[PDB]
Amino acid sequence: DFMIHHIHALTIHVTILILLKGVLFARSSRLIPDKANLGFRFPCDGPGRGGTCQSSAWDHVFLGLFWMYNCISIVIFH
Amino acid sequence: IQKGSQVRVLRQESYWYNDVGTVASVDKGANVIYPVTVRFEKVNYSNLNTNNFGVSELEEV
Amino acid sequence: MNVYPWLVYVTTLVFPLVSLAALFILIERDT
Amino acid sequence: MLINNFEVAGAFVAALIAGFFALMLSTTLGK
Amino acid sequence: KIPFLSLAPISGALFIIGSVVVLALANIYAKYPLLHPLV
Amino acid sequence: QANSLPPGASSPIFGGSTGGLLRKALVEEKYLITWGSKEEQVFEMPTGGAATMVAGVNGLYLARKEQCHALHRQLVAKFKIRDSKIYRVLPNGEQTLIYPKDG
Amino acid sequence: SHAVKIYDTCIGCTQCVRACPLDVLEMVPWDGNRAGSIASSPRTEDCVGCKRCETACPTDFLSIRVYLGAETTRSMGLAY
Amino acid sequence: TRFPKFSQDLAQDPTTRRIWYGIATAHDFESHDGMTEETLYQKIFASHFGHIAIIFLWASSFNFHVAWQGNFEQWLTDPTKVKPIAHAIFDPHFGPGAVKAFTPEGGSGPVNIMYSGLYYFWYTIGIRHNSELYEGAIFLILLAALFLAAGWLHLQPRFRPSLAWFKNAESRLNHHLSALFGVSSLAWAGHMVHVAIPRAYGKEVNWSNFLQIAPHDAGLSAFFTGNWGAYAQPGANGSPPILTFIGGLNPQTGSLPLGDIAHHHLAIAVIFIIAGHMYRTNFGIGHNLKELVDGQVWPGVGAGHRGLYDTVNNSLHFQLSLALASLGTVTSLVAQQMYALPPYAFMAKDHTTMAALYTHHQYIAGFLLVGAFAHAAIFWVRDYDPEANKDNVLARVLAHKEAIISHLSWVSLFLGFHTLGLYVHNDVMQAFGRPEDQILIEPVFAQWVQAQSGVLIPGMAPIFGFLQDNATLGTTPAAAGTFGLGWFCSVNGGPGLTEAATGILKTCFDNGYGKLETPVFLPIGPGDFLVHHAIALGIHTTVLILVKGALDARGTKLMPDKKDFGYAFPCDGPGRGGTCDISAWDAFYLSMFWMLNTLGWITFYWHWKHLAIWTDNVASFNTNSVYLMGWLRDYLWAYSSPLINGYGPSAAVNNLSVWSWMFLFGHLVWATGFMFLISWRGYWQELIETLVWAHERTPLANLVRWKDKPVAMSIVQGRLIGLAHFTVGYILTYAAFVIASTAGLS
Amino acid sequence: PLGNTIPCSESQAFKDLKDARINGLKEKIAATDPATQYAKDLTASMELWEYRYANYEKNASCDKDSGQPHLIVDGRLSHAGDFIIPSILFLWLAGALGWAGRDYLLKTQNAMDEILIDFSKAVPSLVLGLAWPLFAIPQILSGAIRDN
Amino acid sequence: PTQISLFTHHMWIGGFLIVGAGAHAAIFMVRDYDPAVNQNNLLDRVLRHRDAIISHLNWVCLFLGFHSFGLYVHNDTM
């Protein structure tokens, strides 16, 4: 029970990490300073500066859906 | 090649290679490399349908 | 059995970390 | 009957010849 | 062209459902065949 | 001190963030934008947060040239300032202009 | 640094210098169009490769091509 | 930042991308700095010498470990009970349960039970002692030392050869067909007649006595006088036959007879030495390959094959594409003839060895095919010249590439639509309590191939029938004895047929063709039909992805100048719709999943058909292979039982606990792939930017600095690492299952 | 009797599957009330299943061992109802749909009309879909269009 | 089955609405954020140290993953 609740704390905290990093870095980052002009729902800002794949806040919602799946699946399995 | 003539595009790198468009305007300046404006019934991958081509890249049909 | 277990310690544990340290020296020093 | 330690030492002498030739080939491939 | 039934979702979906009903009544009429009976 | 404005430029009122300068600005390069405002007006930082620019010439140090260019395009698209000059600052203090080059 | 080339198919539509977030490009006079100008890249060391100038270019195939090359601090887009 | 020296563009990268790309472009010798063509071919030549010696030291390992800590001489006394042993275990992590679990009965410690068939190999090729295994180990270490010394020698400037020596292609074809494929086959025929055949029948011949003891007692007078047949007779005063043609399998060992092996390696050696006399070398006679290739013209292919000599010869990527495609087709043929006609004694009853060997060679064959089409696309980007290949067949299949891609598309959708529809129909009919409404298609054509092969198939016949002995085919109308009998009683042997009653030709029965397990041609049905169409779907969709990657590698409508961006590049950005996975590397990448799925379907089929045979439960395969809950339940759920009970809290561990741990390991590695495959780059770049901020502001720790800047991995690197984890997890999960399910049958 | 397949008239395991299901039905009718909508559906299922096994009997469906009906596809006229007749039924109705959609595209050539289906140009396309070989064979014999 | 299904359903609906909460907080950040409104308040000062929040979230996510799943992997191994 200790170990399954720390699994649960992990999965809640990673889903927080993904969606909160989407929220706070929605407008700008060190990578893309003008992300708010690109919008909430854009694919990327190109393969340059290394590549900006899934840098939109939408894409953090996209990753947080799988991590919520992970969270709630281990909750109902427990 | 005048206004309203159906042309086929001979450019290899074009989207509209072996496709037929309408000549909308021909530039009368001899310095222009690609003077003939062709409008198309189909668009490219950037949702645009006009281009400037040259004379040698166009075939009259 | 017919084991040299000190050789297992040398070549599976010590010598890989030796090798990664040597390759780190190869990939991180200027000339 | 299995193989004793002296023939394993002979195999290691043979592997030392092989390891020397590999060590020469790898460095002259590195040039 | 008529309102709300001329649309491609509606026309396509009523085509799907009409084909599935005509097929289901064909399976009821033919007593659920695996093959076409020759004899 | 280590981040000193040119004489004639005043600092905008900002309570300082964590999105700003790192060790690269000490050791490799940093960038400096100077613009001219007619009043004190509230602008979004490119590194996160909000700041207020005072009337006069305002200078700001950023880690990248794109942060300065995004700040300049936001100043054009919202508050109509088109005389931002973007400079590249070396660690020894040598100054060169990089935007605009043409004048 | 990434390598930026502008061919002769450019029509001088003034769109690749506005869509650039880094000011790599500029307009010089030219004779081969109606607009009288062509884009050029004298500042390819500051280019990050973001391909916003190629999204905005309105021809059939893009008159400007950026080629991904050797990477630097400026071209990896690093604030550190 | 001096590494990598071979790319200055990579070396001045200040980030962590420099190390990853120096590792990943280390063997792309053409794209390295200052590389000329002479230096290219000579570095590849010495790399080959080093690799051949790696293969030999790896081969010497087996001989050393079985001679030092195996049980080979103990296994010759009873080949049917005591299990082959690979090597012994020294792992300090084991507790007492695992120490006693990996220890056999009568053993003095924990060992690995060998599942690769090397004891059966070494028995059939006539090793009978650990000392012969030891001299094999010594000879392979010194032969590896000779090949490294040769590579070292051929990088010295007196023995470096010229590009003309590399690009001759006449002498290379002559010498490889004559010496590499023919003299070595002749030498292996000589080994089988001198060593393996008389050590099968007691009479042990070694390196001290081989000059005195002959293989046949009418020795080398039967060669020159034209009486070749005396090698095939039993002969006088002993002398078992060394060049014979029983055919099929041997009854007494369940394997291929050794005289047929020796006669095979004589005959194809003769054919290969004759085949290495075709091409033009320095004695005037022969074919020159430029006029021989460039003279294939007929008026439906235009210019024909003109210029394809230089197209193959100057491009190593075309040559490597042909080599990998041929080698993988050969490797699939290796896998499919080892189960069908087993070559080594007592290998067919060791079931998990047959499973592991088939699955081994088939997965490796899928790798070589996808690499063949990868280097095809690499040829298209880097080496193809449209002006040196004017209107030849290569330019025409570039010209109508739209037809090939759309027709592979049509075959793939055809096969997948109908195979999925019939399988899901069979699922719905077993769901609704109705297994007699299932669409069940007897494979008529493959049973007809069985019928002309010699299998009964009692409503099908050969077209030209049988001869007067009713065992020889009508399509081989000579040789009544020599191979109606052996081949016919092999392909209709096995358990469940050729019983005591009979009434037809299987009345004979006393040669021993009922003690063989499995028929040579397995019986087939509707599940076999459906999984063959699934196999065809897998192969065709993999060919679709790969041929689309090869032919679109130069350019398309969406990206016309693709060849200027190389083989492996990320995209051309989000514009013109978006261009994710546009490169030919990305079609390698996406076909890799389809290859793994294809070879999963192939080895899932082989495994369930053989475990249904081995558990005497072929009715379970014939009932449940037509629908997919049968594949889930009776194959995947049912045979998982000794695997996942390899360790647990209530039963103590056994020898399958390592396969249980590796099964969960592969599940973990496979799903760790999914992170790099689903989540992509800019998330990780922004995350690492926060990590950079956290490190430079933590005291006691900002005083420790990186020398390469922490960045996220690149787009192509994120794809490649996710694929490498997917593939490693795939192979380890299935290797764990295919060994632990079959070793835990009992 | 072809390879690992014999017809239903001498198949033991088909007779076992048949009797198992008929006796399971007779036990399911005989334990219930005949006026409660369960039993008349079971007698309808009984009559339907007796007709289905008689149908598998008289037209020669074919089994062995597991006693379930296997179908033979190479073009025998004795097993023509396995493949040949639902082949030409599939060709008729799929060529109807494909030719109707193709002729709809040839008569419309418009982007509003692909999302708003004009039925006056859609249902006669479907009727000439119901006679598609007579309109599609001479256009194969003529030729379609020049494009590369 | 009512107990397993009601727990499991309400867990899944709960997790979906929490990912939607992260989604519309990010959508507010792109669209409806005004620097003129949020000077030196809680919402502005959160953006001002967002690197500290996301890096500390990254560390506790790593800590939870090691100290729950490496325990499970230890149990596998032992």
Ligand code: CLA
């Ligand atoms: C990327 C995604 C994508 C999407 C969203 C579409 C979407 C569409 N495609 Mg399409 N397509 C695609 C990719 C895509 N395509 C690709 C990759 C190809 C290959 C190059 C094609 C090639 C293609 C072709 C060739 C055609 C389409 C057509 C269409 C349209 C179908 C209209 C419809 O379904 O209603 C269906 C409407 C009917 C079936 C009307 C009949 C309804 C009757 C009259 C009602 C009365 C019946 C009554 C209820 C009784 C029922 C009984 C019954 C048995 C009769 C639709 C908007 C078709 C089109 O243009 O629209 C017509 C068409 O011809 N596509």
Ligand code: CLA
């Ligand atoms: C004789 C066979 C042969 C030869 C000589 C080559 C040679 C070459 N290939 Mg290659 N290829 C082959 C077969 C071959 N290939 C096969 C069989 C495949 C299918 C898998 C491929 C698919 C392929 C692709 C897509 C590419 C090449 C490329 C290349 C070139 C450079 C390779 C390089 O620098 O990076 C070396 C390779 C790596 C650094 C990848 C390492 C991945 C490792 C091996 C996976 C193992 C993971 C892990 C460590 C396993 C441990 C598990 C355990 C811990 C549980 C080179 C000319 C590249 C090129 O650009 O061509 C010019 C290129 O992009 N190949």
Ligand code: CLA
């Ligand atoms: C109940 C049985 C069943 C079902 C549900 C399907 C379902 C399907 N089939 Mg089909 N098929 C069946 C039985 C069935 N099939 C049988 C018994 C045969 C043997 C004759 C076939 C042979 C067949 C072919 C050749 C094709 C299909 C295809 C298809 C797919 C689209 C067809 C369609 O009507 O869309 C609407 C119609 C169109 C979009 C155009 C009509 C094209 C038709 C199908 C072919 C006509 C072309 C030409 C005259 C003849 C083809 C030459 C051929 C000999 C190679 C679809 C999922 C297609 C496919 O699998 O995709 C790759 C396809 O081309 N099937």
Ligand code: CLA
């Ligand atoms: C491609 C794969 C495939 C194939 C070949 C089949 C084939 C079959 N299925 Mg099946 N099925 C499939 C996939 C497939 N299924 C899938 C994916 C599912 C899950 C959804 C099912 C679920 C399923 C069920 C539950 C059942 C079947 C049944 C059947 C059988 C009877 C169909 C029939 O003859 O009707 C009769 C045909 C005629 C009487 C011919 C007359 C046709 C008229 C003239 C037109 C009707 C066609 C159509 C509606 C178009 C409209 C035309 C318009 C002009 C009105 C048949 C052998 C039934 C069965 O008993 O199995 C043995 C049945 O119980 N299937």
Ligand code: CLA
């Ligand atoms: C392109 C589709 C395709 C592909 C790749 C395969 C591939 C394969 N089939 Mg096969 N098959 C197909 C279609 C296909 N089939 C069709 C449509 C049928 C009729 C239902 C069959 C019936 C069949 C049987 C009975 C057997 C196989 C078998 C096999 C395997 C061995 C090779 C062989 O026998 O060749 C034979 C393939 C053909 C003769 C068909 C070629 C593909 C045609 C040209 C596509 C168009 C068919 C057309 C629509 C049919 C209607 C014509 C007319 C009546 C209108 C192989 C992997 C064997 C097997 O399962 O191994 C255990 C087996 O014996 N198939």
Ligand code: CLA
């Ligand atoms: C007018 C409809 C129409 C017609 C005549 C065709 C015809 C064709 N298709 Mg296409 N296709 C269509 C619609 C159509 N398609 C749609 C809507 C899609 C998106 C799902 C596609 C996706 C598609 C792919 C991926 C491929 C083809 C291919 C092909 C060719 C091979 C035969 C085949 O397998 O068909 C296959 C048909 C499908 C897979 C789609 C299923 C059938 C659709 C739904 C029919 C559309 C119905 C339409 C709305 C009816 C309107 C009626 C009108 C009176 C209002 C053939 C010429 C193959 C090819 O290139 O061959 C060389 C190929 O790989 N098609």
Ligand code: CLA
């Ligand atoms: C099973 C596959 C898998 C695994 C192991 C991970 C693991 C991880 N993910 Mg990930 N992810 C996955 C699938 C997976 N993910 C998928 C499919 C997606 C797509 C949606 C994502 C998307 C994703 C996002 C968007 C994020 C993560 C994050 C993380 C990290 C979470 C922190 C943590 O758990 O602490 C510890 C690490 C583990 C529990 C991994 C196993 C460690 C083992 C038990 C220890 C090994 C011991 C030793 C080192 C071995 C030495 C052997 C030697 C030979 C090398 C972690 C490293 C988050 C992150 O970075 O937060 C910090 C992050 O934001 N993931």
Ligand SMILES: CC(C)=CCC/C(C)=C\CC/C(C)=C\CC/C(C)=C/CC1=C(C)C(=O)c2ccccc2C1=O
């Ligand atoms: C010399 C040498 C190698 C020393 C060893 C160096 C040492 C101590 C550990 C080895 C490094 C390790 C273990 C991790 C770092 C890798 C990393 C940046 C992962 C984040 C990342 C993820 C998770 C993705 O999914 C993804 C998808 C698509 C594109 C990019 C990415 C991406 O970037």
Ligand code: SF4
């Ligand atoms: S790739 Fe991006 S940064 Fe470079 S020139 Fe184009 S728009 Fe500017």
Ligand code: SF4
């Ligand atoms: S390159 Fe493209 S965007 Fe730039 S001026 Fe020319 S046409 Fe306009």
